[PDB]
């Protein structure tokens with residue numbers, strides 16, 4: 280029940296829509312939150328060091 | 329200002345004095361037409377101020 | 379090649395090159411149409 | 425000129441038959457007009473959307489079928505007929521901006 | 522817009538009779554007697570001539586010219 | 587290219603609302619079907635720019 | 642009015658009601674409403690039309 284690891288799901292669930300009309304890719308909020316989680320873990324490591 | 333389709337339809341509705349007994353049905357295709365199967369009417373009108 | 383057009387309300391025969399600001403000679407209009415095609419077009423009486 | 429009667433049983437529920445001659449003679453003839461509009465922008469970079477001319481086929485020295493209706497400037501000319509999938513504006517965008 | 526060439530029901534030539542019709546209404550003539558003068562026995566031709574609206578002139582007033 | 591004949595004359599043509607690649611020489615299809623974003627989804631998803639992404 | 646059938650050429654038993662009436666055509670036409678769907682495209686997230 281206590282979660283200490285996170286299963287990131289396959290790229291099938293998370294779309295990456297490269298908007299050809301612009302220089303960008305529409306991305307799921309889940310991928311952004313995964314990026315934020317990785318950043319948080321790394322900055323926690325940095326602050327511990 | 330009259331659209332081309334309406335103009336063509338109105339031109340089609342116009343009767344002709346040609347005797348139909350002297351001609352034959354145009355065959356399938358042959359859109360050029362021959363002497364027997366078709367006639368031609370050329371209409372050119374230009375509107376200018378007096 | 380002369381690429382020609384027609385203006386908004388005086389119908390002046392305005393050949394303009396590309397990138398030119400849209401102006402009517404003998405006027406100052408800035409709305410402008412294209413002339414009709416020269417190619418033959420077949421219509422059906424139906 | 426409507427006639428109130430039953431005919432051919434093809435007018436069961438609110439259906440109503442027409443006269444083929446009347447339709448041929450322009451009765452009920454209608455026209456549908458649709459607009460097609462495109463924009464050519466100049467971006468923050470000093471570059472702009474540009475329209476190429478018709479794609480002249482090398483084999484025939486003539487525009488390809490998909491580009492048949494386009495004029496020299498790359499824009500379809502009024503008066504010509506248009507079929508499905510054919511191009512009306514040969515618009516091209518700068519990929520950088 | 523413009524007067525149709527043929528009557529919808531019968532198909533009699535009615536396009537040519539329109540112009541002179543306005544001439545008849547140009548004078549004192551009423552509608553019914555004008556239609557009688559033009560020779561429209563059945564009422565479909567009379568309907569087509571009577572109910573027509575000459576929008577073509579109003580549109581031509583907006584034509585480029 | 588054509589897997590069998592090797593002809594590189596693959597052309598894109600629009601079918602009855604289907605995007606596919608077919609070889610003009612042997613009429614054999616090399617790739618069919620395309621995946622595009624729907625408006626109901628394009629309205630919800632948010633676009634990202636390179637600057638905010640890199641920080 | 643007394644009306645003869647076009648098909649049979651015989652007079653109709655019952656009198657028919659002729660008259661000019663105002664018909665207005667509607668925007669809803671079959672040419673725009675007809676639709677057929679082959680395999681066609683699918684959506685990235687849920688693979689449905």
Ligand SMILES: [Zn+2]
Nearest residue numbers: 385388402405
């Ligand atoms: Zn002008």
Ligand SMILES: [Zn+2]
Nearest residue numbers: 528565566567
């Ligand atoms: Zn009539």
Ligand SMILES: [Zn+2]
Nearest residue numbers: 588591612614
């Ligand atoms: Zn092949």
